């Protein structure tokens, strides 16, 4: 009941999916062959972990997930890796030719050849559900498949599932690990296209994650592997409310009510603490107060922006591990008197708290120290608009000269689609301004 189907699109979506499902398996005690010794319900159940795993008669716990990519090399690693026995072959869909970092190819030329097959597999997953709650979609902004195919997919899902809720986990481009100079184009196009079809979207700034790995983890040159293990910790914290239950656990949809005051303003800022290496964790024991203060340090955000220069519209704190409410309350009382936390005048100044008692988990060979308690903060702040502004600026620099545009026109797109998307971004920035202005 309340099942969630995860959809991993493109290299970023797939590799992040890999990280997440390995971590989920560790958190629930599911082995790489799908067996879950601790589950005495054989063939099914209504446990909290069933929101994410279906069960076969032979006792296998199978991710409610589809992995999709327009070329095979990335999914082939899943097909031959440690968790290859976890997924049914039908959940892993690949084409033969990718989108060449081109949104036009992902949404049209190549995407149209595989979209129906993908929807058919999603339908098979949906039919196994007694109360499908919605979808979680993992993709990059910059790739041709992550942008174009994801947009196409979201539009088709709005047709087949109506207003059934669709959440995004989106990789926002950063120069340090960038693979295309056209990532700003793809980013603006996909954001314009999916804006109406997404209910909530968690952006992960690759530069922010890169910086956190370098600073807090003492990793000289962080790879995708480093970044993805951190990202999965954030995703796990966000979905823990769906996968575990407890007296003080709060469902993600309850937070979602607080996080989205208007349909378009649906981009929460995530912060996660503590991020610390084993070497540095061997000495300090980080208290509830310490990790909560960490949440209001700009260097710990998943998107580079300055919340001090914006206004808050919602703050949710998602604790997991050894945390009792008395200590949360005392911590929050401290932050309210030491930090510059300005709310809009139309929204109550209050922190929404959820606590999961299951301790954070680390993957063996990881870089994160095992800690006793952790917190993920989700806030809706106008400061996240800074991220849109930087992207829009790169778009404008190239689009004034129409650089690289012929690659999109050649694949059937028109310049009108570009200026449409950019005006929608301009309106989004103006929206973030209006919600911040004091009432009359």
């Amino acid at each position: 009941m309340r099942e969630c189907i995860s959809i991993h699109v493109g290299q970023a979506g797939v590799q992040i999916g890999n990280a997440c499902w390995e971590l989920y398996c560790l958190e629930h005690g599911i082995q790489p062959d799908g067996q879950m010794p601790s589950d005495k319900t054989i063939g099914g159940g209504d446990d909290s972990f069933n929101t994410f795993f279906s069960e076969t008669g032979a006792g296998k716990h199978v991710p409610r997930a589809v992995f999709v990519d327009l070329e095979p090399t990335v999914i082939d690693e899943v097909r031959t890796g440690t968790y290859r026995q976890l997924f049914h072959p039908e959940q892993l869909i690949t084409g033969k030719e990718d989108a060449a970092n081109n949104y036009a190819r992902g949404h049209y030329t190549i995407g149209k050849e595989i979209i129906d097959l993908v929807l058919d597999r999603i339908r098979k997953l949906a039919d196994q559900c007694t109360g499908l709650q919605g979808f979680l979609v993992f993709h990059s902004f910059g790739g041709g498949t992550g942008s174009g195919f994801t947009s196409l997919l979201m539009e088709r899902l709005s047709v087949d599932y109506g207003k059934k809720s669709k959440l995004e986990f989106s990789i926002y481009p950063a120069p340090q690990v960038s693979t295309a100079v056209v990532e700003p184009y793809n980013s603006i196009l996909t954001t314009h296209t999916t804006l109406e079809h997404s209910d909530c979207a968690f952006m992960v700034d690759n530069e922010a994650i890169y910086d956190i790995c370098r600073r807090n983890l003492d990793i000289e040159r962080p790879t995708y592997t480093n970044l993805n293990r951190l990202i999965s910790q954030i995703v796990s914290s966000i979905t823990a409310s769906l996968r575990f239950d407890g007296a003080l656990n709060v469902d993600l949809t309850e937070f979602q009510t607080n996080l989205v005051p208007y349909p378009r303003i649906h981009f929460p800022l995530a912060t996660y603490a503590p991020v610390i290496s084993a070497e540095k964790a061997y000495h300090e024991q980080l208290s509830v107060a310490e990790i909560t203060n960490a949440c209001f340090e700009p260097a710990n955000q998943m998107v580079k922006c300055d919340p001090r220069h914006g206004k808050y519209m919602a703050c949710c704190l998602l604790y997991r591990g050894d945390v009792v409410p008395k200590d949360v309350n005392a911590a929050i009382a401290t932050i309210k008197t030491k930090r510059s936390i300005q709310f809009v005048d139309w929204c109550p100044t209050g922190f929404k708290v959820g606590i999961n008692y299951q301790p954070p988990t680390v993957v063996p060979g990881g870089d994160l120290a095992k800690v006793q308690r952790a917190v993920c903060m989700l806030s809706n702040t106008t400061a996240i608009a800074e991220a849109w502004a930087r992207l829009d600026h790169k778009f404008d620099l190239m689009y004034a000269k129409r650089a690289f545009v012929h690659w999109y026109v050649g694949e059937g797109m028109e310049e009108g689609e570009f200026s449409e998307a950019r005006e929608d971004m301009a309106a989004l920035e103006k929206d973030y301004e209006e919600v911040g202005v004091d009432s009359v």
Binding site: M1, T257, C347, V435
Partner: protein
């Protein structure tokens, strides 16, 4: 005037309702299986007000459990006295109401409401002479607020001449689940003004303040708040459940307590409330119960009664005590605060005494006031509503379920009229 049909809806409605049935079952000598094991026939003289008789000297609560998600009612089945409820009176959906009044009242709730009415109708048919209905719910969520008020409207349609009575929990930022609570509560108050005869306003802000300031509990849980609610619900219903010098029912109570049809929102209170642990054994006295029962800090809906006037007051004392001392104390309390009682309703304070104290206490007192200071409560919700509504924040959760802004504007106007009505009698 015998049978009352009880309905509890949503998470808060079912949690407080379950405690209500635990507490009064203990008082009436009913065990979690429904068998009587008490020592007095005082326990059984009016047991039929709230319980039906089955086969084998079994007593079954005349109670209907409603929710749009199964979680809370599984907790009720698994909890103490879960076995006491009629299995067929559990009516629940699977979708939930997402803390959304519109979902509870118009879309998800509309699909479940007829099933609930089948059970209500079946229970009413078994009543020798049905008095009316009591409903437990919160106003800040979706099922209790939205579907509870939908249920009330349907019941008034099918039983227009019976008393409709609610125990309604008001939201507060101090104990809040979502920001949209002021929307859900304003929409519900508009329904209550129109379709209930008596409404006990149980304010989560006051419950919190009592647990914090008075009982010295740093981290108040819903369990603490609900123990306060259970004690107040037991006290207000004493007169209905036990024999005494008062043969009252819901209708006589309403005629005596409600001078104008819209002003039917009561301010309940309980005494004693004492933090641990030395005083816990100290013998409490009638003058201390009477003075504590009228203290503003002891009220379960906090609207400093000193800022308003009392239209009517009912006071219920429980345990063995001197009725002469009770009279003297109530008289002197009135003489000491007679500026706080409207002079145009003579003898508007009524005292009742019941011999059986609640479990755990030698004596107690329960306050029921119809005071103009309740306006502060509606004023508080009204401000939270307008701060958001003026910017139309969070409206999309409601507009997407079919509602439009006019309905919000109407509810807000109706509640401001209620405030100015209370204000009108505060100065007369």
């Amino acid at each position: 005037m015998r049978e009352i049909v009880h309905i509890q809806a949503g998470q808060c409605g079912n949690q407080i309702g379950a405690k209500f049935w635990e507490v009064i079952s203990d008082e009436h000598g009913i065990d979690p299986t429904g068998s009587y094991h008490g020592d007095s026939d005082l326990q059984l003289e009016r047991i039929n007000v709230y319980y039906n008789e089955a086969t084998g000297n079994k007593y079954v609560p005349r109670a209907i459990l409603v929710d749009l998600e199964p979680g809370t009612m599984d907790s009720v089945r698994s909890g103490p006295f879960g076995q006491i409820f009629r299995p067929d009176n559990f009516v629940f959906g699977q979708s939930g109401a997402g803390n959304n009044w519109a979902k509870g009242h118009y879309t998800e709730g509309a699909e479940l409401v007829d099933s609930v009415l089948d059970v209500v109708r079946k229970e009413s048919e078994s009543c020798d002479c049905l008095q009316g209905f009591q409903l437990t719910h919160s106003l800040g969520g979706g099922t209790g607020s939205g579907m509870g008020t939908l249920l009330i409207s349907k019941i008034r349609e099918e039983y227009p001449d019976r008393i409709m009575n609610t125990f309604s929990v008001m939201p507060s930022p101090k104990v809040s689940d979502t920001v949209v609570e002021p929307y859900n509560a304003t929409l519900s108050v508009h329904q209550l003004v129109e379709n209930t005869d008596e409404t006990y306003c149980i304010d989560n802000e006051a419950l919190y303040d009592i647990c914090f300031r008075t009982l010295k509990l740093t981290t108040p849980t819903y369990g603490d708040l609900n123990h306060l609610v259970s004690a107040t619900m037991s006290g207000v219903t004493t007169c209905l459940r036990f024999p005494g010098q008062l043969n009252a029912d819901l209708r006589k109570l309403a005629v005596n307590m409600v001078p104008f049809p819209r002003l039917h929102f009561f301010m309940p209170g309980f005494a004693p409330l004492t933090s641990r642990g030395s005083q816990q054994y100290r013998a409490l006295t009638v003058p201390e119960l009477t003075q504590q029962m009228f203290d503003s800090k002891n009220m379960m809906a906090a609207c400093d009664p000193r800022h308003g006037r009392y239209l009517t007051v009912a006071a219920i004392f429980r345990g063995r005590m001197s009725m002469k001392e009770v009279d003297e104390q109530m008289l002197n309390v009135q003489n000491k605060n007679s500026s706080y009682f409207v002079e145009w309703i003579p003898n508007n304070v009524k005292t009742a005494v019941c011999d059986i104290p609640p479990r755990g206490l030698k004596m107690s007192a329960t306050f029921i006031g119809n005071s103009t200071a309740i306006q502060e409560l509606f004023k508080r919700i009204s401000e939270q509503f307008t701060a958001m509504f003026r910017r139309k924040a969070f409206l999309h959760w409601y507009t997407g379920e079919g509602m439009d802004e006019m309905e919000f504007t109407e509810a807000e106007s109706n509640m401001n009229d209620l405030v100015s009505e209370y204000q009108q009698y505060q100065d007369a």
